[PDB]
Write a protein that binds this ligand. Sequence first.
Ligand SMILES: OC[C@H]1O[C@H](O[C@H]2O[C@H](CO)[C@@H](O)[C@H](O)[C@H]2O)[C@H](O)[C@@H](O)[C@@H]1O
Lengths: 142, 142
Amino acid sequence: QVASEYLGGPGGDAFDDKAVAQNGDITRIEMQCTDVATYIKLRYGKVDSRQWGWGNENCIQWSKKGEKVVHELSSGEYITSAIVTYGKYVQSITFKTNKRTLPRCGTSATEKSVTVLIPGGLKYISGRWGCRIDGLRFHAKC
Amino acid sequence: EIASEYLGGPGGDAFDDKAVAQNGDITRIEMQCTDVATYIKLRYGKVDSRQWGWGNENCIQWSKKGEKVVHELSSGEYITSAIVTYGKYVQSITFKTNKRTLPRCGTSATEKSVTVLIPGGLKYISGRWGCRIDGLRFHAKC
Ligand SMILES: OC[C@H]1O[C@H](O[C@H]2O[C@H](CO)[C@@H](O)[C@H](O)[C@H]2O)[C@H](O)[C@@H](O)[C@@H]1O
């Protein structure tokens, strides 16, 4: 389907949730949040994707870790907007749904900002990951 | 139907291309481009909408007019996103298709920017118009 540009840097390893997303619409958002967002993990239908970020606990060598933030989406709720601050890594992620606006993951919002609107709801994410979220791309439903 | 939020201000007159878009998929983008985008007029199949913007030549007493820009879409080419900078009016529009990123209409990109994904390709637009493009909504195919 249609996707956004890649937002982020060249580090890490590529991931793409296209296949796991075929299990269903996003039902849950999980992130690890401190002054930056350190991982993202979505659930597609009943099927969690991988933890994309915070590859192992020794990543504390290079960044704060943060706390786990879970937002369960209700039936018929979908993400219509992503505000992402980023440079060589994703710094922060603020999601809005057709039902409500979620708190930003990442308290610092100092990097360049981009707002991506997804009519009909975000289908899935791809990007690059390691100790952090090197980059994100947003994929619509067709 | 899947459609983006309305991007713009409350001035002008509402337009909606729903009916004229029954004439077919979008085959051409026509705009008027200066420091800002001053009208848009898409072609559906062989049939154009009315000109949405630059209502009359006295509009030069409020803003610059600009030059006609035409992008012909190849068959099977469809519009997949738009970067829109906007405030009281639409300032600039940068259309992207499944085949290429097109030139910006509107050299100034200084107001609020958003990247609208248009899942499945752009079906038609609606919005508000007058001397300028007061605002736009993008209607997606799926
Ligand atoms: O622990 C190994 C390395 O961890 C960091 O680098 C990784 O994580 C980054 C953010 O996800 C990626 O950009 C990078 O490509 C990964 O290797 C850290 O920056 C390095 O110093 C460590 O060697």
